[PDB]
Design a protein around this ligand. Structure first.
Ligand SMILES: Cc1cc2nc3c(=O)[nH]c(=O)nc-3n(C[C@H](O)[C@H](O)[C@H](O)COP(=O)(O)OP(=O)(O)OC[C@H]3O[C@@H](n4cnc5c(N)ncnc54)[C@H](O)[C@@H]3O)c2cc1C
Ligand SMILES: Cc1cc2nc3c(=O)[nH]c(=O)nc-3n(C[C@H](O)[C@H](O)[C@H](O)COP(=O)(O)OP(=O)(O)OC[C@H]3O[C@@H](n4cnc5c(N)ncnc54)[C@H](O)[C@@H]3O)c2cc1C
Ligand SMILES: Cc1ncc(C[n+]2csc(CCOP(=O)(O)OP(=O)(O)O)c2C)c(N)n1
Ligand SMILES: Cc1ncc(C[n+]2csc(CCOP(=O)(O)OP(=O)(O)O)c2C)c(N)n1
Ligand SMILES: Cc1ncc(C[n+]2csc(CCOP(=O)(O)OP(=O)(O)O)c2C)c(N)n1
Ligand SMILES: CC(C)[C@@]1(C)N=C(c2nc3ccccc3cc2C(=O)O)NC1=O
Ligand SMILES: CC(C)[C@@]1(C)N=C(c2nc3ccccc3cc2C(=O)O)NC1=O
Ligand SMILES: CC(C)[C@@]1(C)N=C(c2nc3ccccc3cc2C(=O)O)NC1=O
Ligand SMILES: CC(C)[C@@]1(C)N=C(c2nc3ccccc3cc2C(=O)O)NC1=O
Ligand SMILES: CC(C)[C@@]1(C)N=C(c2nc3ccccc3cc2C(=O)O)NC1=O
Ligand SMILES: [Mg+2]
Ligand SMILES: [Mg+2]
Ligand SMILES: [Mg+2]
Lengths: 582, 582, 287
């Protein structure tokens, strides 16, 4: 039973009712930046002892940290901001969280009810603005609805297909005194009547049947399986089916396994795309057939029966029409199909060794590779050295760009919730903040943000938060002085014509600019630089052993290119494997 | 005649047609940050020599710099960004520009037409998201509409009541080749039929009549007169009417004048609010009767006939019902009324010396003041010393908070376009970026960003832009280690209970954190610190004389409070004039 | 043309809706509030400061009284045909201007507005902003229930009436003394008019009768009422028009009087769309 701070019949401010509504939801952490419209809320937060508030230096950091918190754990992210400028500063975060289906609850303070529409001071139609970029939102119009709306937001944000839910709370409601009713029922008739029911055996056995009838079965795992790590594992050790995952599904199935095809897609391995290009059966679990994974949909698995299991009906059949589909929780489906494969084991006698070898050939004929030049540090190598020194147990947060794809390719994640990257919206500046969220959600864990000089400088101000909050965040900054992924798309489709991709200072293009070391210095964060591949281990070992937050600026040659690479809309026969800017 | 880069019959990419559409609009400057969806556009920009592109380190800086560019000059601001994360990063800027009625044109790249709604990669319903926070927006659906839509955007953004206009341009359209028609007519039948016509004499003389019938006339000038500096001046030297302006109207009428009542409102002078509280005639020109200016509308000028001249009909009568109103350009109205006051001069024989004295008493009984403690630097004094050393000729950009109100109170702006502050939305982190925009728009001018430690760290990354772009931006950072305006609202209404307003490091709350000096150091920007009020002049003189960008971190005691202060919704009889946190 | 509207006058606009004030015509003086309160207020001032003011507009009133006599509302009578205007006037007369009038939309609508003198508001129920046809009969039902002991008369057009003719069933079943003065001109009057004025009188599907016998009145509105147990009659001669209307009024219960009129009639005066006072048309029809 929840021990309240107020008497069951004692009236208290709405702001207090809100905070208590969060405590009753198990919330222990929020990322809130003060403002006129949310002052009451903040005051109410200080009255709470079960909830720690991590003050960011910019709302965008707040929302991204909330995402980190969410992605790095099972709990949803909770961020709070004031009206107008505060609120609009969360917009990027919500779109990000909506595209990557991330549990999030955003509380924005609003101007008093009567002033809504009057175009008052620091007022913005936040609900209208965030309609198409959130799972659902609300505008509290009665202090008596606070309990119900908060419970409904957390429910919606974490149930079905997880998503961001924003709650606008007018200032005057925050002040209004009242006696909360924590027994009110949720008003979600439509939603509840759309919640998938446990998978039926008729559908599950129909799949197992297709497996036994297949000769080239390939698992296409996505971030929809992040909670089915075990079930998914048991499944593979019962079918011996090669597993290929999306960028979002990394970790679901250990990348360092024998049956692992690693990440597939635009920048996936050549063998991962090969397996899918020639499979006769595609087991698409927890995936949404994104473009950077299929390219030309008519050429995607064109020679295979597609079984698509998804919790979201709308997703099923949207891009690629399945042969067999199952609208439901992938975890339940897995446990089910596992039982059938366990009993009817001998009867089935599944063997895909022939397929596995056909692939094991491509896997050795086109493995992930990187070139080393003189004593320069190869970003890929750096990451590998990190995987090594952290024994693949580190939680990685990332920015967006080349450095992002490498962190995805050269690190072997043991479990999900270990890889926190912006994939659907691909928002730069995600990394550092996300690492903050991860570190708070996982105090006793190695948290490392692998950033790009572009993505990092974008939210560099969160270094202040890292210090003030005493968070052991390790920043492995792969510095290439450019906007890598963009300067790359130039050498590939625009005759290498520099389109404002240089981030250094033209007055001295030989000097590293900005000096990321001094940035950390300003925030009391110990740092170092590495340029020689030779002293790279000592470097990374130091960053890891130095207690507290740390920043390692590891210089890399910009010419590097992320390969393999299947151009936008292309096919497996368009996979590029050679080229750069040397 | 515009000399094109392509033959009148030569087909070129849509992206090229766009850029040429901007050149034909007189655009010389853009603030664009690269992305997949805008690459074609950027490439097209490099083909242009009349347009300089200033690459920011974050889109929000881009849009705020575009605002600075716009506010600091007459031209509109033009910012460009890619889809998804790039685009949502402009949201704050648009709301800001919409609330402070600022000419702005935002070009966001979108995913290919066919992929719209497919929920593709890096895709966002930008048009839907920015509907309620822009003057108007567009989604280009045909490469043949680029010429017309661009011309319509610049028209709408700069005509009537200036505002932000966003243009979404799908990627595939940017690639599509075509032959532009620069003679197409604009499709704005409704808008054109709502454009106010020149003021009628019957209405203008009705005002002049009310002036001669008044004994206590008070001018209530707002940012709607930023282009009527002369007309407004001539008017005063013909009626001798005391002038009080909004935060947005600063500069319209020289603050260092004898007839100047300075800024009125929540933080306006006591005499400015007095004059309005006891005037019998309020000449509201270019104002929108905001809350932080009237408070309780029933008590605002309750004893006076209100003449409201506005270019926006919707604004007239919205908050305060006028006795006489004029929907039209305030500049035209002024020139008109000036002629009448010039001819019927002797006949009228206007004399308000009695009124002016009644006010001149309050002006001396309650002048703007600030206290000095020991050798500590008083933020107000610092600003005054700056006004002095720059001879009131410096363009000031500001953040939001206490430091913002002081920059508004203790500096005497000679003309409009000299004070660039976020007033309607009050977005923090506006300052530095805005100064960048001002410096590019005014190369040979003293540009000084007066920031708060909170507002500054929020977009600190633009220091990289300052350096790389070689901009003589001077940052007078009033460092008080707190969120001043917020910590203030606590000592006033929350018993001084700290609600996460401390920006320093709790581990050593005696040390200045962050070290803003090192931030500039990282970006090759010379800096210094000042703590003693004694060496404050040498300090500021140095910042001004050191060629190039400069950052002066001037330490101030946080306890300071912005006075006078009329609480939210209060009246002239609620004006606070004593209190702080000593 | 808004620029020509009262272009020579100071406009005082009192409205309860702020958005309305200044929307189309910028006022010199405006008052956002209840017009009733404003009136009571201004009345007191005009009552006290009466002698002081000594208001006299006799000169103005005469200047107008000249135009009022130089261009009064008129209508022409042809042979024994019934002039729709006259019919309405005869109704105003027999009902002593105490009848609640509901109307359809079209010529017949403008005439009911011009040739009847309403004593109070809530007596004239017409669709003016949207101008929805078929409003009349139903509206009369609403009026009759809201005013049991009152003379309710729907002045309809053959077009507007047939559109909701089914409510006759409601009239009967509900026992409502609804009187239908149907001005039958066999056409879509207001529309056939806009044709003779701007389209060289080219018939654009405005004929509501049967082409197979364009001399017969179609539909037979009498039989419609017959189907619903509603007593009816027809009038064609201007001579027996009074007896007709008197009967409709005296026959207890609902009643329908189909009064035939020559379609050529035109609603005048008429200022074309967007025109000005100098565009006022006062002569023309389709004879
Ligand atoms: C620079 C850049 C390059 C990229 N390159 C690649 C690349 O080469 N390869 C690649 O894979 N991606 C790449 N991406 C990421 C890519 O855009 C997509 O975000 C990713 O492929 C989506 O993977 P997903 O469908 O598995 O995850 P999501 O998009 O998160 O979709 C998960 C799906 O699982 C469903 N689901 C959720 N929970 C459950 C449950 N309990 N039971 C059943 N179903 C559930 C959802 O409703 C949904 O349909 C790139 C992104 C960037 C920024
Ligand atoms: C911390 C903080 C404190 C604040 N404190 C104060 C304070 O104490 N006092 C104060 O004044 N403000 C204060 N503000 C600013 C305040 O919120 C409003 O932005 C400001 O009062 C608006 O002034 P304005 O109406 O003159 O300008 P705007 O809001 O820009 O409105 C201009 C008006 O002029 C009209 N107009 C435009 N062009 C023309 C033309 N050519 N001809 C005729 N009409 C035209 C517009 O359409 C509009 O109605 C504060 C803001 C912050 C962030
Ligand atoms: C907020 C935002 N702005 C612009 C983009 C466009 N973009 C897509 S990939 C990429 C790569 C560059 O960044 P960097 O951090 O330096 O890393 P690198 O790719 O060089 O490793 C960019 C700029 C984006 N995704 N998000
Ligand atoms: C983006 C954003 N976040 C939060 C607020 C709420 N807020 C309003 S005034 C204020 C004052 C504090 O900042 P600082 O820059 O340190 O200056 P000071 O007031 O101390 O001079 C704040 C945080 C805002 N206006 N914009
Ligand atoms: C429901 C509907 N359909 C069409 C119109 C277009 N319209 C406008 S005035 C008019 C006049 C014709 O009707 P009628 O009832 O015969 O009367 P008359 O004008 O002939 O007296 C018409 C058809 C309308 N206002 N409403
Ligand atoms: C798991 C189900 C319940 C899922 C996919 N279905 C909805 C969902 N539920 C809805 C319920 C009522 C009305 C509109 C809806 C729209 C959606 C939607 O697709 O966004 N939300 C979800 O998470
Ligand atoms: C940001 C968008 C505009 C970006 C990265 N996206 C595409 C893109 N363009 C495509 C064009 C045709 C068919 C499939 C595509 C898939 C993608 C994709 O990778 O999402 N092209 C681009 O430049
Ligand atoms: C100066 C006039 C033209 C002004 C105030 N009026 C509009 C304006 N013009 C419009 C024209 C057509 C349809 C809706 C509109 C809404 C507005 C509005 O108030 O936002 N825009 C302006 O700048
Ligand atoms: C951000 C909002 C919520 C902020 C600054 N705004 C008010 C506020 N509250 C008011 C409440 C009643 C009457 C007039 C007000 C005017 C304001 C105003 O100054 O704009 N109170 C606040 O806390
Ligand atoms: C149903 C509409 C389209 C109708 C009756 N309305 C007009 C019309 N057109 C106008 C065209 C220009 C200026 C003023 C007008 C006023 C009207 C009006 O009477 O409302 N023209 C028409 O045909
Ligand atoms: Mg980089
Ligand atoms: Mg400060
Ligand atoms: Mg008719």
């Amino acid at each position: 039973t929840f021990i309240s701070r107020f008497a069951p019949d004692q009236p208290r401010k709405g702001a207090d009712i809100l905070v208590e509504a969060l405590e009753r939801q198990g919330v222990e952490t929020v990322f809130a930046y003060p403002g006129g419209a949310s002052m009451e809320i903040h005051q109410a937060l200080t009255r709470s002892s079960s909830i720690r508030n991590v003050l960011p230096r910019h709302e965008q950091g707040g929302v991204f940290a909330a995402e980190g918190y969410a992605r790095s754990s099972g709990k949803p992210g909770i961020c709070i901001a004031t009206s107008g400028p505060g609120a609009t500063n969360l917009v990027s975060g919500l779109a990000d969280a909506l595209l990557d289906s991330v549990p999030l609850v955003a509380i924005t303070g609003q101007v008093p009810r009567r002033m809504i529409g009057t175009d008052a001071f620091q007022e913005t139609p936040i609900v209208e603005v965030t309609r198409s970029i959130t799972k659902h939102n609300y505008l509290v119009m009665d202090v008596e609805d606070i309990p119900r709306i908060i419970e409904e937001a957390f429910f919606l944000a974490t149930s079905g297909r997880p998503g961001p839910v924003l709650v606008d709370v007018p200032k005057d409601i925050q002040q209004q005194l009242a006696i909360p009713n924590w027994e009110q029922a949720m008003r979600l008739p439509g939603y509840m009547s759309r919640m998938p029911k446990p998978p039926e055996d008729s559908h599950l056995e129909q799949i197992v049947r297709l497996i036994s009838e297949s000769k080239k079965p390939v698992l296409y795992v996505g971030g929809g399986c992040l909670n089915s790590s075990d079930e998914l594992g048991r499944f593979v050790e019962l079918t011996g089916i090669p597993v290929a995952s999306t960028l979002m599904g990394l970790g679901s199935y250990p990348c360092d396994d024998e049956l692992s095809l690693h990440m597939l897609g635009m920048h996936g391995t050549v063998y991962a795309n090969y397996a899918v290009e020639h499979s006769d059966l595609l087991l698409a679990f927890g995936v949404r057939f994104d473009d950077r994974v299929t390219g030309k949909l008519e050429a995607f698995a064109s020679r295979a029966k597609i079984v698509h299991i998804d919790i979201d009906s709308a997703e099923i059949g949207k891009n690629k029409t399945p042969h067999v589909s199952v609208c439901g929780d992938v975890k339940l489906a897995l446990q089910g199909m596992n039982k059938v494969l366990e009993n009817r084991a001998e009867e089935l006698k599944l063997d895909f060794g022939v397929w596995r070898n056909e692939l094991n050939v491509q896997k050795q004929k086109f493995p992930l590779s990187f070139k080393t030049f003189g004593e320069a540090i190869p970003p890929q190598y750096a990451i590998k050295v990190l995987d090594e020194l952290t024994d693949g147990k580190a939680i990685i947060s990332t920015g967006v760009g080349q450095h992002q794809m490498w962190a995805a390719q050269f690190y072997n994640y043991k479990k999900p919730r270990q890889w926190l990257s912006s994939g659907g919206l691909g928002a730069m500046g995600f990394g550092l903040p996300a690492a903050i969220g991860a570190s708070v959600a996982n105090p006793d864990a190695i948290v490392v943000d692998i950033d790009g000089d572009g993505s990092f400088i974008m939210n560099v101000q969160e270094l202040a938060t890292i210090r003030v909050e005493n968070l052991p965040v390790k920043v492995l900054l792969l510095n290439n002085q450019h906007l890598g992924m963009v300067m790359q798309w130039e050498d590939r489709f625009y005759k290498a014509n520099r389109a404002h991709t240089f981030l250094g200072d033209p007055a001295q293009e030989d000097e590293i600019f900005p000096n990321m070391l001094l940035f950390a210095a300003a925030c009391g964060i110990p740092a170092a630089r590495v340029t020689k591949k030779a002293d790279l281990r000592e470097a990374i070992q130091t960053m890891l052993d130095t207690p507290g937050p740390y920043l390692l600026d590891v210089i890399c040659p910009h010419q590097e290119h992320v390969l393999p690479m299947i151009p936008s809309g292309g096919t497996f026969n368009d996979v590029i494997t050679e080229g750069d800017g040397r």
